[PDB]
Chains A and B, each alone.
With several copies, the nearest count.
Chain A
Amino acid sequence: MRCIGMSNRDFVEGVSGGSWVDIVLEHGSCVTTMAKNKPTLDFELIKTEAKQPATLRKYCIEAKLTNTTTESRCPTQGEPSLNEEQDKRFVCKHSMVDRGWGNGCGLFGKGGIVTCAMFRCKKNMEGKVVQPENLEYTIVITPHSGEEHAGKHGKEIKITPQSSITEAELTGYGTVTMECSPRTLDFEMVLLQMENKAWLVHRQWFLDLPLPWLPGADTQGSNWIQKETLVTFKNPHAKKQDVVVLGSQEGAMHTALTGATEIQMSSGNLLFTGHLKCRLRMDKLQLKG
């Protein structure tokens, strides 16, 4: 009934016997195949999703600062240093500040000062790269029998442009053999994920985003790159300097993505509206009854 109720329905039939029959599968449409002494079948492409696509880069969009520490030297005594300046979890800056008798120095003049603060990301987003392969299409093959329900599902099969020819069993009728091709969907693009909501964005834009990031293959989630993007170092003072972090950028991001094609998703997987070309053989199918 599902296919009968669809407006987009193709009727295909093989002009030979034991031959292959071609059909085109689209989301929201179905194809009904028929052949002499063979049951009539319904085909529908219901899902197209990328499974575990490679993570390109994790961007931090909200952070906090803790243990801010300052060190400074008098004019003439070189650049000061802090060992935490070697700890990848800190953001640091080197500057010069006036010094003199009023703050412990023999000479009046510029002195070297350094300040570090531990950087802790509280909310990040990640962009992934979807490979044409590893995409998984779900196709339902339903026997056109007319039997009732209101336990009789069509066979569901999942394939990949890398999987081999499929032999699907249809309880009662035998098996149907088919092969598909993702025949023309693009992926120099990237898929941005901001807390269960995703978007398709162009590359080099994602890579240019001024936000702290980490190479995709990370798990520490601590050694952020270019933390200064979310940190501001106020003008220093003889012995102390304040450091403040920008506020969340989730908003600046949202109202920045308006326009780019939004991508649905669930269970962490991204979903797309795929297009398939398949060929099937019915030599192993027979009438039930």
Chain B
Amino acid sequence: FHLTTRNGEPHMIVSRQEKGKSLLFKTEDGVNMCTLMADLGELCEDTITYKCPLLRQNEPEDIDCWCNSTSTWVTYGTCT
């Protein structure tokens, strides 16, 4: 995935071949591990973009993306 930013915050452009794998990227505050559980398809015009909240010792609820060290934005296409 391509690591960029959105208003100072880290942003992940996730491609199709990353479905099912732990997303890791270094940050001043250590290594960040986001988990993507998404309709994740091929990167195209039909993108969706939203935030993966920070979750410390809390079970996830009503979400398919979350990181454990620093909240991150994520973007991926839905095409197939």
Are B61 and A71 closer than 8 Å at their CB atoms? no
Task: Return B8 CB to nearest CB of chain A, in Å.
Answer: 14
The residue of chain B having its C-beta at the shortest distance from the C-beta of A104 within the complex is B53
Residues of chain A within 8 A of B46, CB atoms compared = 65-66, 68
Name the residue of chain B whose CB is nearest to the CB of A74.
B53
Comparing A27-35, A140-148, A236-244, the segment that makes contact with chain B is A236-244
Query: Which residue of A69, A100, A104 contacts B48 across the interface (Cβ within 8 Å)?
Result: A69
Closest to B51 in A: A239
* Chain B nearest Cβ from A13, distance in angstroms: 72
Q: Which residue of B lies closest to A117 (CB)?
A: B48
> Which residues from chain B contact A69 at a C-beta distance below 8 Å?
48-50
Distance A102 CA – B41 CA, assembled complex (angstroms): 13
Interface residues on B, range: 20 to 34
Residue tally, chain A, CB below 8 Å to B: 19
- Whether A98 sits at the interface, judged by CB under 8 Å, is yes
CB pair B45–A103 under 8 Å, yes or no, is: no
Whether B63 and A103, one on each chain, are in contact in the complex, defined by CB atoms closer than 8 angstroms, is yes
**Closest Cβ neighbor of B60 among chain A residues:** A102
A 52-66 binary contact with B (CB < 8 Å = 1; else 0): 000000000000011
Cα distance A2–B62 when bound, in Å? 64
When the two chains form the complex, which single residue of A65, A70, A100, A104 contacts B50, counting CB atoms closer than 8 Å?
A70
- Which residues of the partner chain B approach A7 to less than 8 Å between Cβ atoms? none
Residue A11 interfacial (CB < 8 Å): no
| Contact A98–B55 (Cβ < 8 Å) | no
- Name 4 extra pairs, CB < 8 A, besides A102-B63, A103-B62, A104-B71: A68-B48, A69-B48, A104-B53, A240-B50
- Supply 29 A–B pairs (Cβ within 8 Å), ascending by A: A65-B46, A66-B47, A67-B47, A67-B49, A68-B48, A68-B49, A70-B49, A70-B50, A70-B51, A71-B50, A72-B51, A100-B61, A101-B58, A101-B61, A102-B58, A102-B59, A102-B63, A103-B55, A103-B60, A103-B61, A103-B63, A104-B53, A104-B54, A104-B66, A238-B62, A238-B63, A239-B53, A240-B63, A240-B64
Give chain A's interface residues, CB within 8 Å of chain B. 65-72, 98, 100-104, 237-240, 242
